[PDB]
Each structure stands twice: as C-alpha cells, then as structure tokens.
Cytosolic purine 5'-nucleotidase
Amino acid sequence: KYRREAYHRVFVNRSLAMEKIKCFGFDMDYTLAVYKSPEYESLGFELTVERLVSIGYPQELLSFAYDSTFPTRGLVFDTLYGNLLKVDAYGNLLVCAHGFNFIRGPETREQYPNKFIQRDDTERFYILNTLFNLPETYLLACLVDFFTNCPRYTSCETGFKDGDLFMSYRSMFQDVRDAVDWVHYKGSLKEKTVENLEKYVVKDGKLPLLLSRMKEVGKVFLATNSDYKYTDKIMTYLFDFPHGPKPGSSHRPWQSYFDLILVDARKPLFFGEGTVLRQVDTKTGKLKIGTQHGIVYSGGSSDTICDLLGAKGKDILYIGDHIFGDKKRQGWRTFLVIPELAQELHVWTDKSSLFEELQSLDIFLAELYKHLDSSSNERPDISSIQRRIKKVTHDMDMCYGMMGSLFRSGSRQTLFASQVMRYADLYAASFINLLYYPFSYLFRAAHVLMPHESTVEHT
Amino acid sequence: KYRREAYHRVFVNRSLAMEKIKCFGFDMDYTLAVYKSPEYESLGFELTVERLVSIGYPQELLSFAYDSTFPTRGLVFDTLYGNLLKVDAYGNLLVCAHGFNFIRGPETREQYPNKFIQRDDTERFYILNTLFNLPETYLLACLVDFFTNCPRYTSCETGFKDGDLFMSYRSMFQDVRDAVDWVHYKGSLKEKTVENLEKYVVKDGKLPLLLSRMKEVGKVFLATNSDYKYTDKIMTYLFDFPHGPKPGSSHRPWQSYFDLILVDARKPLFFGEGTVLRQVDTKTGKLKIVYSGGSSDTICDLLGAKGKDILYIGDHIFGDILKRQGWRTFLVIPELAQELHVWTDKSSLFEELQSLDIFLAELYKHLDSSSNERPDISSIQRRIKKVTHDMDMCYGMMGSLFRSGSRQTLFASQVMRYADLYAASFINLLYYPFSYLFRAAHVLMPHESTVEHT
Amino acid sequence: KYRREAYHRVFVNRSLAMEKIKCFGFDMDYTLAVYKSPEYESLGFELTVERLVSIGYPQELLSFAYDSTFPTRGLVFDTLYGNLLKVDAYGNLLVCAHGFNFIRGPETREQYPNKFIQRDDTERFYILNTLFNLPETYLLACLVDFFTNCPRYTSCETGFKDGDLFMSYRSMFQDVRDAVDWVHYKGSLKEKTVENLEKYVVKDGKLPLLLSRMKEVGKVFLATNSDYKYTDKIMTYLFDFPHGPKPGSSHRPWQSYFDLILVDARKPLFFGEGTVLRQVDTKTGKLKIVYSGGSSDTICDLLGAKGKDILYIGDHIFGDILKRQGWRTFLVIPELAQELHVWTDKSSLFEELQSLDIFLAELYKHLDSSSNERPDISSIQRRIKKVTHDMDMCYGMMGSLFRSGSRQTLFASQVMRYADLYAASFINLLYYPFSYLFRAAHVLMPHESTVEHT
Amino acid sequence: KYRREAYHRVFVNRSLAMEKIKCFGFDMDYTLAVYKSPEYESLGFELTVERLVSIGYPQELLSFAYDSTFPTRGLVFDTLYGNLLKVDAYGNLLVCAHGFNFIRGPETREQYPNKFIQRDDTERFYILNTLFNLPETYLLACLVDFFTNCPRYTSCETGFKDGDLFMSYRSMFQDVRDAVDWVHYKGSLKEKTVENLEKYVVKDGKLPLLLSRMKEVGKVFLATNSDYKYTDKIMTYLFDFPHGPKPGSSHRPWQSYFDLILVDARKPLFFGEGTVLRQVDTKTGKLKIGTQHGIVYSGGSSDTICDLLGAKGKDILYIGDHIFGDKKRQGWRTFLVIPELAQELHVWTDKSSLFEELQSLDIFLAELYKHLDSSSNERPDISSIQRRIKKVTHDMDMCYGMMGSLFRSGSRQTLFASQVMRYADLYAASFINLLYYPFSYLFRAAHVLMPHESTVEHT
Ligand SMILES: O=C(Nc1ncnc2nc[nH]c12)c1cccc(-c2cccc(-n3cccc3)c2)c1
Ligand SMILES: O=C(Nc1ncnc2nc[nH]c12)c1cccc(-c2cccc(-n3cccc3)c2)c1
Ligand SMILES: [Mg+2]
Ligand SMILES: [Mg+2]
Ligand SMILES: [Mg+2]
Ligand SMILES: [Mg+2]
C-alpha cells in the first residue's frame, strides 16, 4: 500500500471525507503559534519560580533549571501523597514518582491499594493535560524533591513540617497552580514572549501557503482565548515574510487570511452558552460599545460562528491542540495537534533495533511452549530471557523521556491515548501536514484491533 | 511466530504468568454450565411471554418465536424512545432499531442530536449486557414492532396508546424487566431446565479433565449465585460420565473437584461487604462442608491466598476499583467461536476491502493540496459500503459483539477494561501449561499500526 | 366587617371582579361529580388490590380495608426508601412514615440529611397530589407495613426480599401506579360506579340552579377528560330531578345547560397544543353538537372569548406559564369542609396555645442579653407539643392538607400559586352575585402580622 | 400579648431555641460593616460611571446623580427588552419600568404574554438581590432612559442604533455588570472607602457590647469574602472607641472578639467544597506558606469551621445580609439582616392613616353586597370607591420608593419576600436587635395564614 512519508502524515481515527469540509477553524496558541521548545517552557518555569519566591518560598528554588527530559504530558498529580502518576485509560498506575524517585514494584501498592486511582475524584487528583502544564509538571517534582531532601524539613505522608506548621502537598499544589495562572494572566510571560518573538515562536512560510489554499475551497476562521493585542502581535509575526502565500507574491495582512476572526473566546464555555458577542476596535484593542466584512469579534459562541458562516457542525473541521469533552448543539469535526508526535516517530523509526530484538525474544518464547499443554509438567526456566525483556522495554521506554511515551507505557495505552482516540477525528504533530493532502482526500480510519483480531489470520 | 489453533487459543489483554496462580475460581451459570443455544434462550423467551400474557398482554405475543439471529449482546434500550442502540466506547450511535426497523443516516439525529447518548444516564438507558439478556433483547424489539404495526394501537414518540390508556416504552420495559426476573426466580425456568438437562446444558469430558489438572497445581473453588438444590443438580449432570477425569479412572462426585464450594454469593455484593457467612446442610439442601453467602474477603481468608494469587473465571463483566486487593480474571465470551468463523471463513470479504483501500491510496498518491483534482470514487465508496454491510451481517442483524466497521463497541471496551484473559470457553486453558507466560497482545494506535520501524 | 357564613364562603388568593367574567368552564370528575366519601375511595382501593393480587401479590392484601383517616392529600412517596413524606413549600420534611411507623426527631436524618429533599427529583419522589391518589396513598403505606411486618420477608433499606427475589420499593410503587391506571382505564371502576350511582355520587338541586344562573350572565362549557358514554351517564344522574332549575319548572336535559361540551380533553395536553378536534355522534356515543379532543385555544375561538374572560372551575392544580393568555381559576378543595370544622369546633385548643404563647412572652418581657436568667419553660414547652399534636390529629393521622403547625405545606403553596379562588365546592358561588368584587385576602409576614399600625 | 418595641424586634419565621445556640457566625460587609446610605451607593455609582466613560461610553453619563428613591432591592433585569421588573414568588409581573417610564395596564401585556416571566431562564433575566446591586439597579434605568430619549439614538425593541451598529440591552447589561465587578475588584472603591471611613461606614458601641455577651454563652466567628488588609481596616474602625465592651472598660483588639477569624471565604463555594485552608500573616496580609489560638484563616470551608469549633449545623447561627440556596452536609441556622426594614416599619407605623382608610373602604364594600347573592341582579356602582382604593394603594406604595416596598406590591408578596421566608430563621433590620433578647430566649414562629385561616374566626 502507498503511504506518504511518516513525518508528513495525517493519522486517522475516524473516517473523514475532506470535500465535505466547508469551514476550517483555528486555535492560535500551540497550533498556529507553536512555541519553541525547550525555551518557552523555561520562560514559564523561571517566571513561575520567581513568583513563588516573592510570596514566601525559599530562595533555593531559584537554582532550579527546567529540564525537558523529565515531564511527559498528561500525568496525574496526587495532592494527597504528592505523586506524579502515569495511568492507563481505566485508572491503573503505570508509573509513580515522588519527586525524582520512582517507586513501582511492591512499595507503590502500600500507598495505592490495587495499583488503582479514582480519576473522577477531582481535587484529590489533577490531570496535567495541556502543553502549558509541562512547566508545573516538572516544578512539582522539583518542589516535592527539594523539601523531601532538605534537612530542616520533616517529611510527612501528606506534606511537610516546613519550619514547623504544616504544608500539605495539596496546599503546595494550589500555590503552584496559582503562580502559573498569575504568570499567564498578570505576570510578565506574554510580555517577555512578545519582546523577543524569534526566540520563542516558530514561523514557516508553509503556514500562509496552507491557509491560502484552504480559503480557495472553503471558509477559514480563528477562535482563540488570547486577547486582540496579543493576537495581533503573534499573528503579524507568523505572517511576517517579504511575500504573501507563494514566493514572488505580495505580502498580505494576517487578517486577510480569515473570513471570521474571534478573540476572547472563553473555551470551553464558548462551545456551550458562551458569552455575549462583541466587536473589537482594530485601532485600539479596546472593545467597541456597539455590535462591511473586515471585522474582528470578541466572546460569543460556537453556535454563533455557524450562523455567521452559514454552516453546521459536520461542515466544520476544528484545528487545535486541546482535548475537550462530552449535546445537543451541532457537533464540529476535529483535527488535533500533538507536537510530541515528531519525537515519537523518530523513536519508532530510528530505534527499530529495539523493537526487532523484542519481537524476536517474544518469538523465541513462543517456541519454548510450542509442544506444551496442561498435561505437561515441564517448567522451562525463562527468568534469564524475562529479564532481557523488562530491561529492553525500559530502554525503549527511556528513549521518550523519564516519564516515557505520551501514548503508552509498555503494552498499555495511557489515559492520554484513550482521550485522543475519544476526541480526535484527525491527528498529527502539526496541522501543516495538511499541505501534503488534496482537499478531495478521503481519510480512512486506521482500524484498532483487539487481541483475537490482531493475532489471528484470515487463513 | 508459533500460535496455537485459533479455536483453541486463549487471548490476552494484560500479561499473566500462570505459575504465579495459586487458586482458580469459578462462576457456574454460563461458565461451567454452558446452556445450549438456541434452545435455552427460546425457553426463557416463551416463559417470559407466557408470564406477560398472564398479566394482561395481548394473545398475539404467544405467536412470537425467539430468533437468535437478531440479538447481539451489549445493546442499549432507550426507555424514552423505545429503541435498541448499539453504541461505541464513548457513547456514539452505531446502530438504531425501533422494533425491527433500522433507522439512521438522516433520521437519527431527529431523535439523537449529535448521534450521541450519554451512556451513564441510568434512568433512561439500560445496557443489556448479559447472556440472560439475549431473550429480553429480542422480546423488547418484538413488542415495539407489534404495537407499532397494529391497527388497535396508536403510536407516540414515548409510547403507544392502548385505547384511552397510555403505555410508555419505559413502563413496557419494566414489565419486561420484571417478567424475566419472575421467570428466573418465582417461575419454572430453573425447573424445566432440570427436567431435561440433555436439551438445555452442554457437557464434555474435558471439564473434569481440566479441573483435575488445576487442583494439582493450585486450589479450586466455586462461587455461584444459584442455590444448592440447583447447583447440585447442574454440577452432578456436568460430571455424570462413566469414569473420572481420564477414561479408565473411577468417577468421583463433582464436589471432590473443589476445595471450597460457595452458593448464594449475591454478586456483585459478594465482592464488597457481602452477606453473613452461612453453611449448608448437604442433606437438607438448606442452612445450616459447602458455604453460603459470605464475601470475596472470606474466600481469601479460608483459602489462605490473596488477590493477585487468584484467577476468577466467569461470564460476567464487573466494575469499579478492585481497598482490599482484587483478583485476576478470565472472561468467557461464547460468541467468540462464531465470530472467529467469520474472521476465517469470510476472508474473501476482508481481502476485497483491503484491495479497495489499496486502490484508493493509489488514486491519491501523486496528489497534495496544490492539486485541483477531484477523483470520482463514489463507485468504490459504494461497494466498500456493501461489503462492509455484508461482512457485518455475517454476525447477525445487529452485527458483531465487538465492533461495527471502523468503531469498537462499548462492549469491546468493557472486555478490555475488565478481563486479563478471554476466550469462547474457559476450557481452552486445557491447551496451555501452568508455567505458561501469557503475554499481552498489543493494541496499536493509527500512527503505530500504519507506519513501520524502518 | 360583614362576612358570609364560613361554610358558604368563597376564599380569595387574588382579586377578581366577577362582572368581567364572560364564560364559566367546568371540570366534571370531583367538580360537578363529587364522588361520595369514603365509599368511592374504598371501591378504588378494593379494585386496585384485587388487580395486584391477580398478578401475583399475596392473598393477605385482600384483608386490607381502606381507612380514610390515614391519607392526607399531597404526600410524597420516596421510591428509594419506601416512605410517605409530608413536606413544606421548599422541601423540608414535616412528617415521615414508613408503613404505619412514624419516624423522625433523631431517626430521620439517618435517612434524610438536613431533613430535606429536593422536591424536583422526579425519578425518586412522586407527589400524590390528586383526590384519585388517596387510595394509592393508603395502599402504599399498607404494603410497606405488611412486607416489613411479615416473617416471610426480609426488609432492606431500598426494598424487601421475597425469598431470593428482591423487590425494590421503586418497583413496588410502579406496580401500584399501574394497577390504579389499569383499574381506571381497562378495569371495572367506571362500570361499578355507573351501576349504583346512588352510592357513589353526590347530587343536589343546587347544581342545576347555579348553572342556570351562570348561563344568564355568561357562557358555560364542559371540558372533561372522561368519554361521552361515561359523561352522559354521570351528567344525566346529576340532573335527574322531577323538575328544572327551580321547583315547579320543567326538567331539561343536562346538555341544555352548556353552550359547549367537550370530552376526551386530555388535560394538561389540552392546555398546550392539544389534540385534533373531533366531534361526537350523540347517538353512537362515538366519533364523528358535542366535541372531542381539541385545545384550550379552540374553546376560546368557538366561544369567542379569550383568557381573562374565562373562569375555569375544577379540582386539579396545573402549572407552568399560562404564550397565549391563560384563564382565571376557581379551585375545588373538598377537604376544606372538614378543616373548617376543626377551625371552629376545636377553638378550645387554639385559645390554649394562644394562652401558653401569651404566658411565655410575659416570662421573658423584662429580660434582655444582659440577663443571666434561664427560666425553665420545659413544662410549657411540653404541653404546647401535645396540644399542637392533638390539634394536628383532628385532621387525620397525616395532619392538615394545608399545614403542619408552624409550617405551610407544599400543597398550600401550590394552591396559592394556581388558584384565584377556592372553596370546598364550586357550589358556594351560589351565595354571591355576578357583580361581586372578590377582594384578595392578604398574606402577612412576621413583621406585618406582629406589629401594629400605631 | 407583650411585644418589644417595633424597632428592637427580631422577627421569627421558624422557631429557634436560643440556648441551643453554641456558635455565632458573622458576615462582615453590610452586616457588621453597615455602609452609610445614600453615600456608599453614590460612591459605587460614580466609580462605575467613571469606568464606563473610560471604555467608550458617552460623557452625558457623568451628569447622572445617584437617586436612592428609585431602586427597590430585588428587581429583575430583562436583558431582552431592557426592563426592570418587580415580580411575585411565582413569576407574575407586578411592576415594569423602561428607564423611568412605568408601563403597566394593557401595554405590558404586548411584551409579556400573560404578564409572566420564566425566572429560571438565567441570562435572559437577572435578579438584583444584593445591596451592592442598588447602584447598578438605578444605573441601568438611567442608561435605558438616556439612550431612549437621545435624538441621535434610534430605539429598537431589543436595544439601540448607537451611532449605528447595534447595542443590545444584553450587551449594555454586561458592560454594566463588568464595570461594577471591576470597581469592586480592581478599581478605587475599597480604596476610597478606607480613606474616609467615618463618611461611609456606621459605628456603634453596641456592636462590641453585643459580641462580648455572645462570647460568654458560646463561640464567635467571622467568615467574610473580603481580604485581610481590608478586614483589618474595617474592623479596627468598627471597634475604635476609647473603651472595650462597656464604658470604663479597657479597649480590646477586634481580633479578641472572635474564636475563629476567616477571610477570603469564597461564598457560596465556601458552603460546599470550599477552597484549601490557608493561614494569614497578621503582619503582612500575605498568606503564610504553612498551615496557640490567636490565628487568622483564609479560604477553607463550612465543614472545616465546625470541625475547628467542634460543632454541627444545629449549633450554629449564621448572621448576614445574603440569601443563599438549596445537602448533604450539616445545615446551619440563620439570621438575615434586611436594612430596609427600618424604613418600612416607619411607614407601617407613621402612615397608619392610609391603612385605616383602606380597611374602612374595604369594610364599606362588604356592606353593599351584604344582602346579595346569585339571585340578585343588583349591580351597585362601585367605580367611585374602586378608584379611591387603587390610588390610596398607590400612595401607600409610594411611601416606600418609586419601585415600592421590598416585600410586597399591594396584595401580593414579592419574589424577595418568598426567598426571605425560604432562607431565614430570624430577621431584623440589623443583628444588633439581638441585644434586646436574653440568650435563653425562645423565638416562636409568627404563623403565616391563608385566606380561609386569616378571615375565619374560631367562633
Ligand atoms: O510542531 C511543529 N510545528 C510547526 N510545523 C510547521 N510549521 C509550523 N508553523 C508553526 N508551527 C509549525 C512541527 C512539526 C513537524 C515538523 C516541523 C517542521 C519544523 C521546521 C521545519 C520543517 N520543515 C522544513 C522543511 C520541511 C519542513 C518542519 C514542525
Ligand atoms: O441598619 C442598621 N445598622 C446598624 N445598627 C446598629 N448598630 C450598627 N453597627 C453597624 N451597623 C449597625 C440600623 C438598623 C436599625 C437601627 C439603627 C441604629 C442606628 C443609629 C443609632 C441607633 N441607636 C441609637 C440609640 C439606639 C439605637 C440605631 C441601625
Ligand atoms: Mg491552544
Ligand atoms: Mg454467570
Ligand atoms: Mg377532575
Ligand atoms: Mg455581606
């Protein structure tokens, strides 16, 4: 079968006939505006720590340096015991780190009977789903680690004797959860991003090319959480080239690429009741009191966008980096951006050696038990080649980072995997990969197989 | 790679070293006592209709004959609109039948906005999950079909009017839900089973052979909901052969094969705090070795094993957490036999879908977003639908237990949530040693299944 | 101030100028056809038990005799815990009875945290609002009492076990809810009523006198849910006197008293979009002046009146908004007769509570927050409870329709929401002219009722 | 029967045995801190208007002067048609003003079929329940009035052609709803309050006297929304006298009057899940990282307060100005402060003349129909004495303000009345009236009567 280059590919969960697509909707942040890594994370990290020190946290936090190789997106923070968990779709603990100490084996079972947690017990647990969470993911580990191994702090099961009244992990977590919020909303993050954009934000002439082609076969819109003056800056930079879509072409304003531009969207509330629809003054950012087609909207709702565009769910492909939830309404189609996927395809490809040795070691196992059944009392020693497995699974796991792959730990899918398969029709490392497909393309679901399907042939 | 004969195989969701397994636990009904099909379903049907009629339903119900080729296990009755729904893992409608009238495409979303139901709404939606539900699955659709297509009745969205008296589908359902219960508990289902077990229960010498081999390497217990007079009848029959485990040997009573036998389990309550531990007068068939009631916890205490040491073998999918560490599970799915026969004997269909997919790929290969080219594929897009429809109807009118085309079923997801192991019968354990290392087969995402390691 | 005899009086929630009233609309059942008490309730009871028994309930149900002194209208069946609750306007528990066992004080909040239920939870709580509910109000408590107090059964929180078969209170309730419906619609309640109307329906020459006087000053219509063969039977009997309106005059058929007669109303649906307008063959007693089905809107069109011009007289409390302007209402509350007799004949109790309250005031008069003085009042605090209990039991075992001591009932609040006027019977209109100005009596708050204008 | 002076009285909805009360809980704002009227309202009003002008509203708003005689607390703003409604418990329109124009009669019925509204249709309607709402209550009327009678604005059914793109009443309302919020939370209201406290806040030596007596018979606590530095200032001023509880006594700190002090309460969330319990640094306001009895708490929950005080709902009388809603939990008793009640008791008392003439005019009516029944065709003309009624009800109504009494319009109770009877065990113009009762007092419910109870004697 013909398949496009791995790194160009759009992966299909549910089938989608692209000619039926009439509108393309865009998330801005971490979608069109992909923030550079490790650098944007570091900026968030440093600003969050600066903010915690200012409210009374110890100075030793300033020596923390962000480390991209620790966090994996989507971990669960247990505010009761101060643990970052990696769990599967159903609640089962895959990985459990206290600070930088990885527990596993029997010792985890003392703290988590049945190696299981109630994911729907919010504000005991906290799911760190988004790309903005990577900083505080690593920070919490640092914090738990520091206070654990600092002699003037006594470690309790649910927190610390800090000096000496009590700081619970739950209080420490809110402390962190507020700092990040503060940094995004009142601190100098957006500010420092904007003042050196070439350091923090990616740009590629492929973005205007792709959008322009979309506007030829359908309508295009923007629905972002960010305000207008932040959006005007970020988009102006994304489209700053000495030309328009193609080389030689005249440069066009970034506004000219959208039939509808909406800011202050308030997602997820946007997709339900929403807020009241406003309009924005291009000249000032400040909202117009009252509410031609060169217009910029504020607030509003999903439903409104369809009414203005003259469309309906089915007709709309919504492109972004965020996984939502859940009717009625009317039910937009979905493209999901997962930047980690560029790294994971390199492991899947450039680390074949490991996958092959696993496959063969597994093969070999099947041979040992070939002429064997319940009658047979032969207990072939397999501890030797068991060991080589755990540990090549460890090595393979560790190519993805210290908390492993985004989508799986060994055999098991992660909770993050299941939600991606819930939420997304289409996915890839970036929407740009759309460039490589015609707009008449028929995306066929890549069928997912149960054991009795995957390992039984049609012969 | 070496793989045992498909019909003998034991499939693996999560890895399991069998040598670690110290006790083997057994469900009885539809595990050790596999009830014959279609005859046992039919009996439950007839008895349930006869009961309904006895409390005022029309005579025309008596000319209903159970039809095994309609019901697929795991469907959802929407008590609001009277529909039988086949949904996916997340609540997406795959299949909607009002009576025997299959609906959607356009006409669903009249009734189900975003072709979606929020699966957890208990008062409206009822998952027909068990093998004992197959009868009422068929009966329910029969009833709605009848009242729709009968001049005596006027049909509303939420029910039908029985001339001046409204009858909601929700109320119709609870009559059907009660009749079945009555028939199992107050009525003569259990009785008419026992009076001709040859017609109603499977038996095979493999079952005592297997349980004998298990008792050599571990402990073995029975944990059933049924009572003792019924259990003794059933277990006695299952073990009635002119010999013991192997040919030649003396026959032994069925009890001899179990270290612990427990009845009146009241699962799922069994698995939580349970009921008080009683024991049973073998003689009286009454209270008050043979235990009654009790707890999951109690079993562990008595057997002197706990948790990961226990392999629970049965036909029922449970839930929740397991404080207190929970058992490993082997799950019986009788439908799996027939479904493997489609997977192997209908390969000509699979291969053709494969060819049509290969072809599509080739039409679009030299094409990107620069291209204006609209290939017409509607011919291909048509045959793919007929083959995919044809393929689905090999499994019956409501399709496969585990999927509809693309999409997995909510059932499939429950199976993968709950079961370490699964097969059409537990008996297939016979073909593996007790030192075996069951290694989880491995469930790939699009980007894993459709790109290679080179 | 001049006020008519209490038993003749028509009470006013909202003001109403009668001269503005152009049409008078009538409910039939329990409005014009007041069914005799306790004999009609008993019949419904016996028929409903006999029906339950016919579908498998124990014989002991047949030795139940309906008892009018237990049920008070407006109680709430909690289908979860099997309790009959008397709550206030906002959902506060006033009275909790499991079977015939009255509960609270301490033991409620075991079951009802904050002695509170969220009244709008339809699937759990069922308001027994109508006069036809009185039978099943008593029956329900009987049933729970029986199954609790019977060695055959084991009682759980959510139900009782019928030996191996669980029976939830919720399932018990829907059996009871269905039996009543069956008895009204499929069974012989309507039939056994018609065969001896002398025993089962009140009649009085005042009814034709009143309706004749109404037709002089406005239009008059009938809007009932019952059919025509039943309506003709009932209306014919109500009007069977050897004369017309006044003594001396010729008798006239009952239809002659109405400008418009409508059956099969299907209220409340009647008041919304309704059903298609049919008319009835007087002869056949069948379709297809006498109308059938239709709409609230249609009545207005045909009568050429609309809304505030119409006074709807009935025994049923409705709801919602009324787009389209809605009618004014007169509400029949038969219980009001008996309740007025307590209010007048038991004045010795009221006066004594008044004296005990006066006394308490005097004990605390010279006292403020500066004072250390704890008067003991527990003797007084005791007798106030016995008199207040004694007073409440004058209205039956479940107290007044409208209140428990301090607190008003959710029923009282519905009455005040829905009804412009109310009385024990509509007949009391007879004592007012059609130029009358009904002026709303006036509902005071603590600071208005307990401080004076000087 | 003996009753205390009207203006000293605590009015009883549901009975309450005061000896059973073990803890007294306090709201601060508009409870202990009663803000002076008309002056605090004016300050809110001016700051809100200054804020609307700054974001683009016309300068003519600056000439608006707050007018205490217009608003009545608890009105409903219809964002669809721009109307302030006064409704009853069940939804029925009692009063309807577009700006300063009062509709009534037939004309209202065109816009509100059945003279009825769905109160549970939020963000069409908005209930202005709180004392902080009085400013924006009057403001909305002004705004609707101004734009209506300003020649360069065209009046639409749902808004205005302002200049000329559209400003809906719904957009104008949010505009207002944000200004007030902004003024409270980011603007100079708290600021300007604090800098001249004797102008804006009441003080009375009765407050320390009463509290001190409460601390002798039970425990006392504070649970306010305001922050610590705002609370420290407001309370310090409330207790600034040259003495403690009684004359001659030594002055004590305001902290010494509470066993538990809690700020940042986040009501109503406080009464459910709450937030995490923190502690505050008395020296800085800034929260302590970690968490003796001289302590000040932050955040937390209802449940926590009981645990710390060692009590349970039944035992706790909660005193404040706000009406909440609604289990489980554990169900505090309730004292509700309604400052308007001091004015309304003056009408009830000093305007008897009107009540008497009504009563007599009503008497006279009953005479006319005395010897009359359905037989009688006498239609006595009563239009003359009908008129004198509507209009003495109008005069009586108008003694309370242009939108009438807080608790009723003519015969009918307001929606505000019903909620007070829902929510409150005890009520009065101020909690201070507790001073006049012993702590052994038995408050007896003042029974509420239906027509057949109120106008039938026991003879
Ligand atoms: O996450 C991504 N984001 C980005 N990808 C492409 N365009 C982007 N505009 C903003 N963010 C984008 C990512 C994912 C995979 C490949 C890449 C990429 C990055 C740099 C250069 C290129 N490239 C150069 C020639 C062809 C492709 C490809 C980028
Ligand atoms: O809303 C009120 N609030 C206030 N009432 C009493 N003390 C307060 N501390 C803060 N706010 C209070 C109000 C309600 C009714 C009467 C009054 C009051 C006001 C001023 C002086 C007095 N007074 C003087 C002698 C006796 C009473 C009484 C006040
Ligand atoms: Mg984003
Ligand atoms: Mg079973
Ligand atoms: Mg009726
Ligand atoms: Mg307050």
